[PDB]
Design a protein around this ligand. Structure first.
Ligand SMILES: *[C@@H]1O[C@H](CO)[C@@H](O[C@@H]2O[C@H](CO)[C@@H](O[C@@H]3O[C@H](CO)[C@@H](O)[C@H](O[C@H]4O[C@H](CO)[C@@H](O)[C@H](O)[C@@H]4O)[C@@H]3O)[C@H](O)[C@H]2NC(C)=O)[C@H](O)[C@H]1NC(C)=O
Ligand SMILES: *[C@@H]1O[C@H](CO)[C@@H](O[C@@H]2O[C@H](CO)[C@@H](O[C@@H]3O[C@H](CO)[C@@H](O)[C@H](O[C@H]4O[C@H](CO)[C@@H](O)[C@H](O)[C@@H]4O)[C@@H]3O)[C@H](O)[C@H]2NC(C)=O)[C@H](O)[C@H]1NC(C)=O
Ligand SMILES: *[C@@H]1O[C@H](CO)[C@@H](O[C@@H]2O[C@H](CO)[C@@H](O[C@@H]3O[C@H](CO)[C@@H](O)[C@H](O)[C@@H]3O)[C@H](O)[C@H]2NC(C)=O)[C@H](O)[C@H]1NC(C)=O
Ligand SMILES: *[C@@H]1O[C@H](CO)[C@@H](O[C@@H]2O[C@H](CO)[C@@H](O[C@@H]3O[C@H](CO)[C@@H](O)[C@H](O)[C@@H]3O)[C@H](O)[C@H]2NC(C)=O)[C@H](O)[C@H]1NC(C)=O
Ligand SMILES: *[C@@H]1O[C@H](CO)[C@@H](O[C@@H]2O[C@H](CO)[C@@H](O)[C@H](O)[C@H]2NC(C)=O)[C@H](O)[C@H]1NC(C)=O
Ligand SMILES: *[C@@H]1O[C@H](CO)[C@@H](O[C@@H]2O[C@H](CO)[C@@H](O)[C@H](O)[C@H]2NC(C)=O)[C@H](O)[C@H]1NC(C)=O
Ligand SMILES: *[C@@H]1O[C@H](CO)[C@@H](O[C@@H]2O[C@H](CO)[C@@H](O)[C@H](O)[C@H]2NC(C)=O)[C@H](O)[C@H]1NC(C)=O
Ligand SMILES: *[C@@H]1O[C@H](CO)[C@@H](O[C@@H]2O[C@H](CO)[C@@H](O)[C@H](O)[C@H]2NC(C)=O)[C@H](O)[C@H]1NC(C)=O
Ligand SMILES: O=C(O)CC[C@H](NC(=O)N[C@@H](CSCc1ccc(F)cc1)C(=O)O)C(=O)O
Ligand SMILES: O=C(O)CC[C@H](NC(=O)N[C@@H](CSCc1ccc(F)cc1)C(=O)O)C(=O)O
Ligand SMILES: *[C@@H]1O[C@H](CO)[C@@H](O)[C@H](O)[C@H]1NC(C)=O
Ligand SMILES: *[C@@H]1O[C@H](CO)[C@@H](O)[C@H](O)[C@H]1NC(C)=O
Ligand SMILES: *[C@@H]1O[C@H](CO)[C@@H](O)[C@H](O)[C@H]1NC(C)=O
Ligand SMILES: *[C@@H]1O[C@H](CO)[C@@H](O)[C@H](O)[C@H]1NC(C)=O
Ligand SMILES: *[C@@H]1O[C@H](CO)[C@@H](O)[C@H](O)[C@H]1NC(C)=O
Ligand SMILES: *[C@@H]1O[C@H](CO)[C@@H](O)[C@H](O)[C@H]1NC(C)=O
Ligand SMILES: [Ca+2]
Ligand SMILES: [Ca+2]
Ligand SMILES: [Cl-]
Ligand SMILES: [Cl-]
Ligand SMILES: [Zn+2]
Ligand SMILES: [Zn+2]
Ligand SMILES: [Zn+2]
Ligand SMILES: [Zn+2]
Lengths: 694, 694
């Protein structure tokens, strides 16, 4: 028999291990020859594995690279202009790789060039609330200062945007051991912690979904018209550079001015964590000087796109996608995900060679340039948006399969909650102590739902990965799953060796998943999801689960507004329309579910499958959110303060945020009311797609 | 048998006559009680005729009405401020209606209030090229002048926009006999010509597809957030008022300054047609003074929406829509169309009572407030956009059925050209001299295609009617057909009694169509189209006809650019990508057509029907055209100089228009190149929707 069990049993931990080793021997930086060679290898193997067609889709996009003959670094500079301390020019390479070439040194991709010199201000994690505390409570002015900020908590591009709007002239990002050194574990090569010479690479763009900075809205193909650099989307205006904690210690130890306002501002280094501006009396005349010489360059990137044509509904696409480009060796990020995808393709191809085809078409993608802003997935989606709009059932992402070894982590649309619960009840837990128990059971025990007893936690989708264009721009039901750690407050900060040269095959094989059983479990969850989506006769979406969360989000946004009762009285701010819409959605979704269970008629079925597929689509507003035209979903958007986190009712949330500080309250509350109207209208309109059609 | 012949034979001229009489006894101005009563009557009759459901959909939109106790008028005012001549306060009512109440006097809907006084400038038809001639060649300055312009050639809202941008302080529109008095025919009541006291009403908005000025993007429902008046879309900033040619003669006869630049500026009145500014020497101190006191008011409007549920594909909608609101009695506009729709509903309902149902769902609509800017159709489409986007097959409009008695006039998407040719070959011509000949034969003889021998003329869709939101915003295949005159250069000017009190049942019954045979022919064309769209197993669209016109439009826009060869050399302006895309579209459409003819499989059929239905949809760009976000179709938009006319490749056309006058040619040509990229990309993307799906 060719059923899900057949598919799942064909998946092998040993194959995932072999592929991970194969993908992590050399760096695969986007836009380099090594990454094009790997693209061609994947294309060849996917063909051999049995896919119907496998093509490369290429685009020419803006990328950013250090200057190989003019290195980036930071100095402390004395009175006469002597550089008395310099940060490192590279991370000490790990054992056995000290002769690997083409390791890109640490840098902040898309930083402009410059050599700003000035006094430091320490800004904690450079969050919106950190800058509020500095400016509003401590009365510290960042204008013309170099800001130094620890990585963690929020996406680094939000830190840089926040520093820019505070008037900083440069930003120094560093990894504090408080956030990147787990107590009781040794530094790499002897454990999974970050060494003091380790540094986290990463882009610092604020693209808000646009894709290639030069071609927002349209694919960066051969004849594309490109914006000039000055009109490009999302580029920072001040130099930025990341460093390790040995270097950070040197920059922070001399800091003077005000003490940290409280303990949540102190990391684990043996320094005071003074906010400054500048150094204590004796060194008051020393300054910090950045030297940044990276260049932005239009460069070709390559996505691999494989197709397994559906036997019954070939014009319905279920997509499994994840990226292939890495900062250096990509031992976790992305190759632990890419190896999982490779073994999924292999398993589907085995069934296919025995005569099976899925009901719907499955597209597999190896995206390029994810690390430079989701560029490959986004340009491809821009090129194919009409096909995806009218045919896309679902998108399952497949970046890193592991960031820990504790339990499952799933973020998805409410439409997939039931599918995930059901699938996980049928899979074996890989966890010690849960042998012979289901994955659902271990996951629910280790990660309890905050709302419901006997259910696991499933989070909203944010952004910072390749599902963004499919979900937030195009309104295609999306999900992601991986194995994760038990470190709640580190949820968005990365595992310690994130985007460092130390993220290697050996890291994974020695410290994370020596038996590749967590990888295998993730392959079963991602592959199982794709299988059910592509093969179930009725699409495995439950609209009633959206109704439940919509009520939760409506209660939440109302509660935020109700912190301002006088203003809601003055400006007649009512949430009645939104609750009415949610109530109607709940009622109509209940009735639709009855019909779906109560309906041999392929037209009624497909009519109903189209209602299910277009339901996520109905939450899209073609006008986008305010000043973010590529974030079009009215229920979910990446937080304006942290791209990694999702926000619900984002248009109303942003209208309410810090509203007590707005100069014209009439205008500000008017915009809250506008956003309430838009949300109520969109929820009612989405509900009406589930009504009987005629 | 229940086939198209059965449907067509049930249609009766005598019924169309009865309904036209019934709909034209009293005025039905949008937002008045009389128009709500007619809505309720139609709703009741459509129920009795057999439709499955018939509901009213209401909205509260910005409308505009004169002040009943403070009348609008224009004066010539002497030196001391004595008003020595006043324009009329109303049109002399026609015989037997001199005691009808609630006839709205002539006014320009949405005019602001004001009493500007100044010197006149005569601006011909107030077209872009008329203002070019005045300002650039004659060096006449309109700043602070009252402009007087004859109606005709272009939509009146474009005239007002052009006057506003010339710096006019008011606009006077009038009907010249050159454009509204056909030689050899008598004035109304004794013929179909405009009397000198007759005046054409009409709105002067520039909404560019937005719908209700206060709620762009969203339906004007009960909880809608409305823009304040100062941020409303499309409102004119200077007072405007229309008058008849008896009054115009009085204003024009004294005109001094420069002579008309040439004869195309002279109408048929016994005046010099001097451009001025101001009056000849003796009257040099007299001025013209407007008195406008109309008010804009949010007012409820009502659409009637009837549904005939499809037997096989109930989730596919074929829509027949036209408006019900009239300026006064609406004898031609809209009731000659509404009576046709009423008899179509009756015929479909007769078949239905005998057990028949169409394959797909047919929606019938009686729209409100068309005269105030397409408000009813647009608000409804805003409310239902997700259903229409994913389910709308086609929209057939049904405003006035006749504007003459000479031959057929059809404007539609290329996807419907074959359907129209085939249907008209099967219908009888109503024309004298063509008895026993097909409508195709008479139409082709009287209105030859300019490209093809043995084919009739079919024009592009522009705007100025209720199909605009469906076609240009949402990308639903649309068409319209009516009987028309033989008066080429009057194509966009209206029949003489257009929007006047003289447009009555008697006008039609005596002078246009005494036997109602032209009405019947139009009912057969509109109803026949709806029947085939709603009942053909394969949708009756031919994609190859789009390929042919795309090549024609590409040649045309290239030819415009090639008037500037030096600039195309300097800025490397290439149309190669656009011709490549058109070539690919032609190739793929040829292959798709072969498969469509060469393919018992309902999934393949419907897959292919979805490819056909979504092909018009593929020409939509979600980002819209520059500064016109609601005009989203890349191939067709209403001309920026004349809303009634369609423009092809509008984004490139507007980038090229008057480019030799732009201050920064580098920037201007860069935008031409951008628009070429967008067009080539969109044509290629639409082509790819016709490729095999997987
Ligand atoms: C949730 O679904 C329900 C349907 O089950 C839907 O109910 C609709 O509510 C609207 C808005 O309240 C109703 O609108 C009314 O319609 C009547 C005519 O049917 C009008 O006369 C009413 O207008 C009068 O009253 C208003 C309020 O006092 C005045 O402001 C106005 O000036 C008029 O005097 C009003 O327009 C509509 O009838 C129902 N439809 C039903 C019950 O079928 C509700 O809107 C949905 N929620 C959302 C957010 O869409
Ligand atoms: C119409 O359909 C045809 C397909 O039948 C489609 O043809 C495609 O054209 C593009 C653009 O010309 C081709 O792109 C090339 O792809 C190759 C790899 O396949 C690249 O090496 C090429 O890049 C090199 O050459 C460029 C031009 O000199 C350089 O600028 C560049 O730096 C590189 O050196 C180039 O990207 C593509 O291969 C074909 N695809 C085919 C034949 O299948 C055409 O684009 C369609 N028209 C439109 C408007 O879409
Ligand atoms: C996750 O698994 C659950 C448990 O199997 C699925 O819910 C179950 O779905 C079946 C099929 O619809 C339901 O059976 C139906 O019951 C009604 C009787 O009320 C009958 O009319 C139908 O003919 C059919 O037998 C069953 O009730 C339901 N169980 C529940 C809700 O507790 C669920 O669909 C799965 N989710 C997926 C596949 O996305
Ligand atoms: C308008 O009417 C014309 C003339 O009838 C229609 O074109 C004709 O359509 C039929 C049905 O597809 C074609 O017949 C097919 O011919 C091929 C043989 O090459 C065969 O493989 C198929 O099985 C089928 O018999 C016919 O060739 C074609 N005639 C033409 C193009 O001259 C046209 O479809 C109508 N347009 C509509 C309905 O929108
Ligand atoms: C990763 O595995 C691939 C595929 O097995 C290896 O590429 C093959 O290498 C052999 C020996 O050079 C060649 O004969 C084949 O042509 C290659 N196949 C391809 C590219 O499809 C590759 O060597 C492995 N890489 C590493 C680092 O082990
Ligand atoms: C930090 O690096 C800088 C740059 O290489 C060093 O300063 C240079 O030293 C060389 C050789 O002594 C001089 O010729 C250059 O003029 C200096 N360049 C600049 C820009 O100052 C500096 O010595 C290093 N500091 C430490 C402590 O190692
Ligand atoms: C237009 O026709 C309608 C329908 O025949 C007429 O309305 C009907 O009038 C009679 C007599 O008053 C009533 O008994 C019915 O209730 C009406 N039916 C409706 C409204 O559905 C209407 O009188 C006609 N109007 C004119 C001007 O002739
Ligand atoms: C044009 O109409 C105006 C407005 O009604 C007339 O002027 C008014 O005449 C009355 C009565 O004689 C005066 O009391 C008002 O003061 C005048 N109003 C204004 C605003 O001027 C005028 O007489 C009419 N002109 C002609 C030629 O009929
Ligand atoms: O440019 C972008 O939007 C993201 C590019 C690149 N994305 C990325 O590294 N994503 C990593 C983020 S690590 C933090 C995180 C965030 C959300 C989550 F569910 C799990 C982990 C990932 O999703 O696995 C980056 O964050 O630098
Ligand atoms: O507000 C608008 O966009 C149009 C409202 C109203 N529309 C209208 O009268 N349309 C009439 C326009 S008469 C000129 C014309 C234009 C195009 C055409 F095919 C036939 C006639 C119609 O289409 O029958 C108007 O023009 O004032
Ligand atoms: C890299 O280093 C120096 C800095 O000016 C120079 O030789 C070369 O132009 C640089 N390369 C760039 C800017 O890509
Ligand atoms: C911050 O500092 C700069 C110093 O030049 C000044 O221009 C700016 O106004 C200051 N802002 C505040 C809030 O003190
Ligand atoms: C794997 O699990 C064990 C047991 O809880 C833990 O001690 C170890 O640190 C984990 N490895 C990683 C990388 O989290
Ligand atoms: C109509 O006429 C006069 C003008 O001021 C006044 O009595 C009334 O306010 C007006 N009605 C309006 C402005 O709707
Ligand atoms: C037109 O006339 C007004 C008169 O005040 C003036 O402001 C404007 O600059 C003039 N424009 C031209 C082109 O003469
Ligand atoms: C109807 O047709 C006749 C014959 O051509 C023509 O003389 C008459 O003017 C037409 N009526 C109208 C309103 O066009
Ligand atoms: Ca792009
Ligand atoms: Ca609106
Ligand atoms: Cl992921
Ligand atoms: Cl029409
Ligand atoms: Zn990644
Ligand atoms: Zn990453
Ligand atoms: Zn009309
Ligand atoms: Zn009209």
């Amino acid at each position: 028999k060719h059923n899900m069990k057949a598919f799942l049993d064909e998946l092998k931990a040993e194959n995932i291990k072999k592929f991970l080793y194969n993908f992590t021997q050399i760096p695969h930086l986007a836009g380099t020859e090594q990454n094009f060679q790997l693209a061609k290898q994947i294309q060849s193997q996917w063909k051999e594995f049995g896919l119907d067609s496998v093509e490369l889709a290429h685009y020419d996009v803006l990328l950013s690279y250090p200057n190989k003959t003019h290195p980036n670094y930071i100095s402390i500079i004395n009175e006469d202009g002597n550089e008395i301390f310099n940060t490192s020019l590279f991370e000490p390479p790990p054992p056995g790789y000290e002769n690997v070439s083409d390791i890109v040194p640490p840098f902040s991709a898309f930083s402009p060039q410059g050599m700003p010199e000035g006094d430091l201000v320490y800004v904690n994690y450079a969050r919106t609330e950190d800058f509020f505390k500095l400016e509003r409570d401590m009365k510290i002015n960042c204008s013309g200062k170099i800001v130094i900020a620890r990585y963690g908590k929020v996406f680094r591009g939000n830190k840089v945007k926040n520093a820019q709007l505070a008037g900083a002239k440069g930003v120094i990002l560093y990894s504090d051991p408080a956030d990147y050194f787990a107590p009781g574990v040794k530094s790499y090569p002897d454990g999974w912690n970050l060494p003091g010479g380790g540094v986290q690479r990463g882009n610092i763009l604020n693209l808000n979904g646009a894709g290639d900075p030069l071609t927002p809205g349209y694919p960066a193909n051969e004849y594309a018209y490109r914006r000039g650099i000055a009109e490009a989307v999302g580029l920072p205006s001040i130099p930025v550079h990341p460093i390790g904690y040995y270097d950070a210690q040197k920059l922070l130890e001399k800091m003077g001015g005000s003490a940290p306002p409280d303990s949540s501002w102190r990391g684990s280094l043996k320094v005071p964590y003074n906010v400054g501006p500048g150094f204590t009396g004796n060194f008051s005349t020393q300054k910090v000087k950045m030297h940044i010489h990276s260049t932005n360059e239009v460069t070709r990137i390559y996505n691999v796109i494989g197709t397994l044509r559906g036997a019954v509904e070939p014009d319905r696409y279920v997509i499994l996608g994840g990226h292939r480009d890495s900062w250096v060796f990509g031992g976790i990020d992305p190759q632990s995900g890419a190896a999982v995808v490779h073994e999924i393709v292999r398993s589907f191809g085995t069934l296919k060679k025995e005569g099976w085809r899925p009901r719907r078409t499955i597209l597999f993608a190896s995206w390029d340039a994810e690390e430079f802003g989701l560029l490959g997935s986004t340009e491809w989606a821009e090129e194919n948006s009409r096909l995806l709009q009218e045919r896309g059932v679902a998108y399952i992402n497949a970046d890193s399969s592991i960031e820990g070894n504790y339990t499952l982590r799933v973020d998805c649309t409410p439409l997939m909650y039931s599918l995930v619960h059901n699938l996980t009840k049928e899979l074996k837990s890989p966890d010690e102590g849960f042998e012979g128990k289901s994955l659902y059971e271990s996951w629910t025990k280790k990660s309890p739902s905050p709302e419901f007893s006997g259910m696991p936690r499933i989070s909203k989708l944010g952004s910072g990965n390749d599902f963004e264009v499919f979900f937030q721009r195009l309104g295609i039901a999306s999900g992601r799953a991986r194995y994760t750690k038990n470190w709640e407050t580190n949820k968005f900060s990365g595992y310690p060796l994130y985007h460092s040269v130390y993220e290697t095959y050996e890291l994974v094989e020695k410290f994370y998943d020596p038996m590749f059983k967590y990888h295998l479990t993730v392959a079963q969850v991602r592959g199982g999801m794709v299988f059910e989506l592509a093969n179930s006769i009725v699409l495995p979406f439950d609209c009633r689960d959206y109704a439940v969360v919509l009520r939760k989000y409506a209660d939440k946004i109302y509660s935020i507004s109700m912190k301002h009762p006088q203003e809601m009285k003055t400006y007649s701010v009512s949430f009645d329309s939104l609750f009415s819409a949610v109530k109607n959605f709940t009622e109509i979704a209940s009735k639709f579910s009855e019909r779906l269970q109560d309906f041999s008629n392929p037209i009624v079925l497909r009519m109903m499958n189209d209602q299910l597929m277009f339901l996520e689509r109905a939450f899209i507003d073609p006008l986008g959110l305010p000043d973010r035209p590529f974030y079009r979903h009215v229920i979910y958007a990446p937080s304006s303060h942290n791209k990694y986190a999702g926000e619900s009712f984002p248009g109303i949330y942003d209208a309410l945020f810090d509203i007590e500080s707005k100069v014209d309250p009439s205008k500000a509350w008017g915009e809250v009311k506008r956003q309430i109207y838009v949300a109520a209208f969109t929820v009612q309109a989405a509900a009406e797609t589930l009504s009987e059609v005629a």
